[PDB]
Design an enzyme around this catalytic site. Sequence first.
Site, mmCIF file in Angstrom:
data_model
loop_
_atom_site.group_PDB
_atom_site.id
_atom_site.type_symbol
_atom_site.label_atom_id
_atom_site.label_comp_id
_atom_site.label_asym_id
_atom_site.label_seq_id
_atom_site.Cartn_x
_atom_site.Cartn_y
_atom_site.Cartn_z
ATOM 1 N N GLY A 134 90.598 53.286 -27.109
ATOM 2 C CA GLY A 134 89.704 53.680 -28.173
ATOM 3 C C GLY A 134 90.181 54.912 -28.907
ATOM 4 N N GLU A 244 120.086 55.271 -36.098
ATOM 5 C CA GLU A 244 120.737 53.979 -35.924
ATOM 6 C C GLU A 244 119.713 52.895 -35.626
ATOM 7 O OE1 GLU A 244 123.771 54.561 -36.617
ATOM 8 O OE2 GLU A 244 124.810 52.652 -36.310
HETATM 9 N N1 LIG Z 1 101.428 50.383 -17.792
HETATM 10 C C1 LIG Z 1 100.419 51.426 -17.862
HETATM 11 N N2 LIG Z 1 99.179 51.213 -18.651
HETATM 12 C C2 LIG Z 1 98.144 52.281 -18.725
HETATM 13 C C3 LIG Z 1 98.335 53.475 -18.061
HETATM 14 N N3 LIG Z 1 97.272 54.245 -18.288
HETATM 15 C C4 LIG Z 1 96.413 53.554 -19.084
HETATM 16 N N4 LIG Z 1 96.972 52.342 -19.347
HETATM 17 C C5 LIG Z 1 96.303 51.354 -20.182
HETATM 18 O O1 LIG Z 1 95.188 52.037 -21.125
HETATM 19 C C6 LIG Z 1 94.358 51.076 -21.442
HETATM 20 C C7 LIG Z 1 92.883 51.516 -21.165
HETATM 21 O O2 LIG Z 1 92.290 51.867 -22.355
HETATM 22 P P1 LIG Z 1 92.201 53.472 -22.682
HETATM 23 O O3 LIG Z 1 93.554 53.955 -23.148
HETATM 24 O O4 LIG Z 1 91.783 54.212 -21.413
HETATM 25 O O5 LIG Z 1 91.085 53.782 -23.873
HETATM 26 P P2 LIG Z 1 91.119 55.204 -24.717
HETATM 27 O O6 LIG Z 1 91.872 55.033 -26.013
HETATM 28 O O7 LIG Z 1 91.793 56.264 -23.862
HETATM 29 O O8 LIG Z 1 89.566 55.662 -25.048
HETATM 30 P P3 LIG Z 1 88.448 55.831 -23.841
HETATM 31 O O9 LIG Z 1 89.016 55.222 -22.574
HETATM 32 O O10 LIG Z 1 87.173 55.115 -24.235
HETATM 33 O O11 LIG Z 1 88.184 57.304 -23.619
HETATM 34 C C8 LIG Z 1 94.703 49.914 -20.521
HETATM 35 O O12 LIG Z 1 95.389 48.964 -21.216
HETATM 36 C C9 LIG Z 1 95.622 50.547 -19.457
HETATM 37 O O13 LIG Z 1 96.502 49.515 -18.843
HETATM 38 C C10 LIG Z 1 99.621 53.703 -17.236
HETATM 39 O O14 LIG Z 1 99.785 54.730 -16.661
HETATM 40 N N5 LIG Z 1 100.628 52.673 -17.161
#
Ligand SMILES: Nc1nc2c(ncn2[C@@H]2O[C@H](COP(=O)(O)OP(=O)(O)OP(=O)(O)O)[C@@H](O)[C@H]2O)c(=O)[nH]1
Lengths: 429, 69
Positions: A134, A244
Amino acid sequence: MREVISIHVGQGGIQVGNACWELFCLEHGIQPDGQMPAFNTFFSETGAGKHVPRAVFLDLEPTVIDEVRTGTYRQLFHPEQLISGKEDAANNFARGHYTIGKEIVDLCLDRIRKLADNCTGLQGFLVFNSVGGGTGSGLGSLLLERLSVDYGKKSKLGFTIYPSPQVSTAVVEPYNSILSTHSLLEHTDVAVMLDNEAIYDICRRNLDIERPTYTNLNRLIAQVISSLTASLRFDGALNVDITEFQTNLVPYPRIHFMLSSYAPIISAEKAYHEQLSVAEITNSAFEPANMMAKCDPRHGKYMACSMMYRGDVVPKDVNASIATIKTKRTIQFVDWCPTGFKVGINYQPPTVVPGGDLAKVMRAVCMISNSTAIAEVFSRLDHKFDLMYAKRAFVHWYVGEGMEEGEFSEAREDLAALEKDYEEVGIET
Amino acid sequence: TQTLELNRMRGMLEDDFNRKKASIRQAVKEENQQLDKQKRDLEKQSNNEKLNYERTEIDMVKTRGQKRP
Ligand SMILES: Nc1nc2c(ncn2[C@@H]2O[C@H](COP(=O)(O)OP(=O)(O)OP(=O)(O)O)[C@@H](O)[C@H]2O)c(=O)[nH]1
Ligand SMILES: [Mg+2]
């Protein structure tokens, strides 16, 4: 005197950046203290030893940035490059692009300008963010707008952790992913899909850990990005600019959606049992089982491909192996790119991060490709959107902030043309 | 005689280069053998520790008789 700026927006970005800066501190000898008993690309010197890294950290949920602020690297990051709002975004776009995000994006712009004025020959940007998020989707899109409107010539290589078509960490991912795609496609030049599932299957097969966690996936992404920056970091027979990348890998102004791969990634025992020759490794790099973006490249035909080698790598066998690859049968290029490969060597072999499941390995290759299989991803992803917008679901959650609704259509419409793109360029002539 | 003095130069340099590279490869093999002991031992420690903890848990659970006031 040729440096990069990295941004970690959202939750995925900040985690992968945590692991990646851990790796970078490990490589350049820089200690958690910020002192050191080559770094001008990432780090910068504050006069006497105590260095600071070139990065900003944005996630309005103050939890993960607090986990950083209290972690083993409290002394390193600039206490002003840790910005976080007082609320969360909750996976909808408008909560991070119209109302809430309207607050700190200006602070991010100020911090970025006050980082860039210190830069000397800054080459490219490196944002890290999910699209299913988000605050990594909305705020990230607005920041991309601000960058693409202010500076210009600089490349903008984003690394978005798209959600796999099968698994799901949220049920409103299609909406705020279509929105992110349509809002970045006009202000980016590179977007390498990094699915969060293909790495799971990788760790399940190459590494035998049936129970991997975000930590190991982030270590692997850090390894990929380090193998990438190995050009600027230390020397090598083929030093290649980051500019590049936007040259070899941008055929047409609208089709710029690459996918990456890394090789080799093995445990200690397999490395004990394996040969790891140049031919073998550049052959394994093409296998579909290790495509970060979960796709089957045979479904399409490549357009461009760049390969960063590092370690004990002899160029003659490089040329021979890539020739044999171009003569291999299962792969297929297109008519409008008879020159398909790009290479770049470096003499910095990979690092054995202690405790990292990866094993000490003499050779390595990172392969970034502009291909056509990625297209079908949109199709299946568009699939979801269909069943979600055929009932006007969750629209009220978006209008309850101030983002106009009709935008949806436009965004969706755009991706439709996007499919047309890979049916207008992918067709021979 | 000069060309022999030079061919022996080439030969010695190459038969030193190759032995050096093979030594590097053997050192890497030893480094991987060493790295294997970490995953050989941490898993053993965690297994024994889970055994002890879960046995203590079973004990603490079973140690609930009757009160009889
Ligand atoms: N491969 C990987 N994916 C991650 C990691 N941390 C978060 N994700 C991904 O982040 C996504 C979760 O949504 P968020 O990024 O937490 O949403 P936001 O934009 O931070 O907003 P809010 O959570 O509502 O505060 C998922 O797809 C997770 O898989 C990580 O350390 N490694
Ligand atoms: Mg969040």
